[PDB]
Nucleic acid binder design. Structure first.
Ligand SMILES: [Mg+2]
Ligand SMILES: [Mg+2]
Ligand SMILES: [Mg+2]
Ligand SMILES: [Mg+2]
Ligand SMILES: [Mg+2]
Ligand SMILES: [Mg+2]
Ligand SMILES: [Mg+2]
Ligand SMILES: [Mg+2]
Ligand SMILES: [Mg+2]
Ligand SMILES: [Mg+2]
Lengths: 96, 127, 114, 98, 151, 79, 206
RNA sequence: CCGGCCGGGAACUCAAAGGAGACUGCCAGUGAUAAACUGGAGGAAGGUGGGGAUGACGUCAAGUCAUCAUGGCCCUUACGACCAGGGCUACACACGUGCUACAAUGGCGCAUACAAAGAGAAGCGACCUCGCGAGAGCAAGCGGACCUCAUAAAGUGCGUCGUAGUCCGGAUUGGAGUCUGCAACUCGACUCCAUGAAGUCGGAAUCGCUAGUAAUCGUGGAUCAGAAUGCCACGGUGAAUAC
């Protein structure tokens, strides 16, 4: 799904941990009853995609930003395809 | 030694213990009344002592978990007749004609992709 | 048996009667009868004058009724003066909050014809 | 005194590293509080089958996950070298301590 | 019912009295599988009717039920063009599956406060056949017997 | 209506508000920041608020403060 | 379309599984991507080495990887050589160390994948499709095989307007779950488009 | 320490691997002495026991070049690429699919009994505390039959309402707030106070369902920072009717 829409998301995971989680928890406590000196939040001028939830969640194989699943990291279309060829450990067509 | 029968109905499993004695009944460490004797099916735990007499001939202490009001009362009912076991297979014949022997196998049927609930079908308009 | 507004309500349990006022929504009426020292489930017969005007003070506390109405209608103009989104909406007869209008914005847009 | 957890999706296999481990004990030192079955947690994954549209289609897959407990009571240094070095079963997850 | 003719599950005779019949009644008045609350509303109207009639309970119910009981009904029959209403003699067993259904159903469409009350007032109006439901018999009679011509 | 702990506003804007306070207003004052909460220290200015195609003039006043810069720059041209 | 995938529905029974490792919710995905990344690279390499199937296992912080081939030597290279240059990168791609066994394909005419692949490769070569379809089905019924059907699809030979056309010789009971059914797939990438090959080979039962 | 809680106990409930069991096979009637049906026996299960998965050759050039792949075609300093703000959320209308009601088989207060099935470390979050509240600070346990989410609701008991546009119904709107997130203006969910539309059961017409089903009642999950009346899954209670 469009190299660049892919590229975008890699840029976002990249930034997502160059700063955020790290530089960005300078906010976690920085905003919590330590009151005040407003310079606190303001700081938020960082890359933008630096933020984690600027990340979509794409079928690791195809890029599909829809019909995704966390267990397998794939779209229902590429999942079924791998499922039927064994390929996905433990997984079979269940009934009950 | 204790004479016993299981009895379980729709996701409820009650274990029923007999002993010749009174006509006192305990369930989940509780009076028959105090549990559901005063609710829909109080009269059914009793049932399994009909053609088979009592009023205070034998004692029954039981426990039961899973399902609900009538499923728990159903199990127990099935465990009583299943414990009247001990007192021969001469009584467990009109316990048959009582319909109390049987394992009420009716379970709840699954939700099924494409429908609303088991059988309930999405209303469809032609156009 | 008037209390507060031109309004004159009663002849049933108190807590509910009080609700008659424009500015009470149960929570207030519970807070009123409580702070008045009154049994909420009382009718007004027995409720001799003594107690009645103690209430009239408790209610006197909040901006209820015509004062409320004016105060509220004031706020709605404030929006309209400012010419902001939620105001421009108020003047247009369409829903302020965000509700879709492609369909079913009816209570706000008023019944249909053309 | 020491119990080992086993999980694997395959079942006609997990109890054969169990009954195996069990054996490789009751031979040596022993004690072993038998192999306990234990709740098979089974995930389900229900997805749309047609590439485009058709919301009533769908495949419905699951992943069963079985467990076994073991529990070995008397820890002989022979028994303790009997799990060690005699183990295998690649797709079986085994947890030593707790 | 194209082929597989069938019998009928046989519900469990009334927990309070021991009657297959009222079980049919309760089930009929019952709604949203609220059996518990269902048998409540029946006995409470039977309680009023019982004493508001005196003459027992069981037997008070049957004589008010003995009224709205139908005997003949008009079964459709869409043949060559015409819907043709064909009167047929109706079974005894259905003879009160209706009667009960028309009684229950009558008291539902009614003005008294509680349903236990309404139920009693139908039971009692029908007792002396002068209720909505009895009229459902004094109409299915009228609508058969007119098609009497057909047979 | 949100925030609770430190009203929000973009930097390049708030400094674009002090490049005219100390100075005295210039022409309009472009911001795309439909985000920001309006501050007392903006009353009297005309801020140009992007709406999608261009920036709408909005004279600021004594009660446009707890309101967003966007609340005064309509975005869907309806008639 | 409306046939349940033959291999897939069997897995529980009679058919194996080509990935067998355990992992928990977390790394499960990270694994799949590794797997589908190793089979990817490996199939582009042993393309002209008749490989029919590559299984993967990650034995505790390590990756095993078997490779079913009907040309075991060509894969292995001059006294071990190749497998080495494979292992090398295969571990470069799995994030962990790598063994890599080389299982042999006896009677490749019986492997659905090696069947399809050859039909696929015969079109690209530029041969009659009815001819190939028929060769396949034969040397197959020949070396055993209680049945086989191969079908193709689309612009068979050149048609502007596309077709399917099959060949079911012998038995192929796709409804019986016991029945050993090796089912696979290959795609010809020809000058007038793409042709999809499906083959079923019925081997036994129980 | 009246908590299966500690000794213990291998009975039972369960857990999950393996087994037996049901075949019209047994009695009988019906039918060609057949196939079958029918009723009876015993039995947890009688007549493919219940549900599921499984969808033949083929029909509609049926749908998918936007999941991916791919023949051909077209753009290539633009049909590609980066960024901000908007838009997909517009609103005279119409149609489909749903959700909530019109109420005493009900509303409300209080007390209180009984499920199933799933989810969890960049997570589930107990406790304690503060806040009417949504929530907040602090902080244990748990990769989990352990710990958390989590106190099921229908229901039952008491009381209250008394058939009224009502103590039924919750729309819309003002006010003030909470959490997520760089960011809740357009357009997020939720909370506190106030507000109280339509609606008294719905024309023509039309849909679902044959039993643990319909109806009703709560519970969980995928996606997901956040965002479910949808979707998928779960048990509770539990019918009417078939000539
Ligand atoms: Mg691409
Ligand atoms: Mg997101
Ligand atoms: Mg259910
Ligand atoms: Mg609508
Ligand atoms: Mg079949
Ligand atoms: Mg089209
Ligand atoms: Mg290409
Ligand atoms: Mg859209
Ligand atoms: Mg209300
Ligand atoms: Mg109704």
């Amino acid at each position: 799904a469009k190299q660049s829409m892919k590229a975008r998301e890699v840029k976002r995971v990249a930034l997502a941990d160059k700063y955020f989680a790290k530089r960005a928890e300078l906010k976690a406590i920085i905003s919590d009853v330590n009151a005040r000196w407003n310079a606190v939040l303001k700081l938020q001028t960082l890359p933008r995609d630096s933020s984690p939830s600027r990340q979509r969640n794409r079928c690791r194989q195809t890029g599909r930003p829809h019909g995704f699943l966390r267990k397998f990291g794939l779209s229902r279309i590429k999942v079924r395809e791998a499922a039927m060829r064994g390929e996905i450990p433990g997984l079979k067509k269940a009934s009950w | 030694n204790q004479y016993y029968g299981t009895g379980r109905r729709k996701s409820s499993a009650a274990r029923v213990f007999i002993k010749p004695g009174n006509g006192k009944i305990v369930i989940n460490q509780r009076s028959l009344e105090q549990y559901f004797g005063r609710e829909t099916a109080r009269m059914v735990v009793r049932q399994p002592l009909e053609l088979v007499d009592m009023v205070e001939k034998l004692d029954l202490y039981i426990t039961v978990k899973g399902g609900g009001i009538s499923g728990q009362a159903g199990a127990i009912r099935h465990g009583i007749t299943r414990a009247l076991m001990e007192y021969d297979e001469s009584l467990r014949s009109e316990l048959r004609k009582a319909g109390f022997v049987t394992r009420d196998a009716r379970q709840v049927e699954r939700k099924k992709v494409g429908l609303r609930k088991a059988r309930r079908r999405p209303q469809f308009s032609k156009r | 048996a008037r209390i507060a507004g031109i309004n004159i309500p009663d002849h049933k349990h108190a807590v509910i009667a009080l609700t008659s006022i424009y500015g009470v929504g149960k929570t207030r009426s519970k807070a009123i009868l409580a702070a008045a020292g009154i049994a909420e489930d009382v009718k007004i017969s027995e409720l001799s004058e003594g107690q009645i005007d103690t209430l009239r003070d408790e209610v006197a506390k909040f901006v209820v009724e015509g004062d409320l109405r004016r105060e509220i209608s004031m706020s709605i103009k404030r929006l309209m003066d400012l010419g902001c989104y939620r105001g421009l909406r108020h003047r247009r007869g369409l829903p302020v909050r965000g509700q879709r209008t492609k369909t079913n914005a009816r209570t706000r847009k008023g019944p249909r014809k053309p | 005194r020491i119990r080992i957890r086993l999980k694997a999706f395959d079942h006609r296999l997990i109890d054969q590293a169990t009954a195996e481990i069990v054996e490789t004990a009751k031979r040596t030192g022993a004690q072993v509080r038998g192999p306990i079955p234990l709740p098979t947690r089974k995930e389900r994954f229900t997805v749309l089958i047609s590439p485009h549209v058709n919301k009533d289609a769908r495949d419905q897959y699951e992943i069963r996950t079985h467990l076994r407990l073991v529990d070995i009571v008397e820890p002989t240094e022979k028994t303790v070298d009997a799990l060690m070095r005699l183990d295998l079963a690649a797709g079986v997850d085994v947890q030593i301590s707790l | 019912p194209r082929r597989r003719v069938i019998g009928q599950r046989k519900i469990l005779p009334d927990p309070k009295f021991g009657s297959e019949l009222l079980a049919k009644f309760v089930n009929i008045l019952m709604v949203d599988g609220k059996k518990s609350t269902a048998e409540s509303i029946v006995y409470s109207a039977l309680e009023t009717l019982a004493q508001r009639s005196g003459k027992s309970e069981l037997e008070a119910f049957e004589v008010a039920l003995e009224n709205v009981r139908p005997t003949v009904e008009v079964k459709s029959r869409r043949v060559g063009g015409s819907t043709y209403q064909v009167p047929v003699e109706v079974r005894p067993v259905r003879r009160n599956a209706l009667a009960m259904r028309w009684i229950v159903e009558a008291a539902r469409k009614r003005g008294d406060k509680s349903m236990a009350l309404r139920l009693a007032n139908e039971l009692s109006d029908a007792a002396e056949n002068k209720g909505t439901a009895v009229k459902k018999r004094e109409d299915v009679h009228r609508m058969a017997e007119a098609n009497k011509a057909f047979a | 209506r949100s925030l609770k702990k430190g009203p929000f506003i973009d930097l390049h804007l708030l400094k674009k508000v002090e490049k005219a306070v100390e100075s005295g207003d210039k022409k309009p004052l472009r911001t795309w920041s439909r985000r920001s909460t309006i501050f007392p220290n903006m009353i009297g200015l005309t801020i140009a608020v992007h709406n999608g195609r261009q920036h709408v003039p909005v004279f600021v006043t004594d009660e446009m403060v707890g309101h967003k810069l966007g609340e005064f720059a309509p975005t869907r041209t309806y008639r | 379309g409306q046939k349940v995938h033959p291999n897939g529905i069997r897995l529980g029974i009679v058919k194996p599984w080509n990935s067998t490792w355990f992992a928990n919710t977390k790394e499960f995905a990270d694994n799949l991507d590794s797997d589908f990344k190793v089979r990817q690279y490996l199939t582009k390499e042993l393309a002209k080495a008749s490989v029919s199937r590559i299984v993967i296992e990650r034995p505790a912080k390590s990756i095993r990887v078997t490779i079913h081939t009907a040309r075991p030597g060509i894969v292995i290279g001059k006294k071990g050589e190749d497998v080495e240059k494979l292992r090398k990168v295969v571990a470069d791609i799995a994030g962990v160390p790598a063994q890599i066994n080389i299982a042999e394909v006896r009677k490749p005419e019986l492997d659905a994948k090696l069947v399809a692949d050859s039909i696929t490769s015969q079109l690209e070569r530029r041969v009659m499709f009815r001819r190939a379809m028929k060769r396949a089905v034969q040397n197959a019924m020949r070396l055993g095989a209680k049945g086989i059907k191969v079908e193709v699809s689309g612009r068979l030979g050149g048609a502007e307007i596309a077709r399917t056309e099959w060949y079911r010789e012998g038995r192929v009971p796709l409804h019986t779950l016991r029945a050993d059914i090796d089912y696979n797939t290959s795609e010809a990438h020809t000058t007038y488009g793409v042709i999809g090959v499906k083959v079923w080979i019925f081997k036994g039962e129980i």
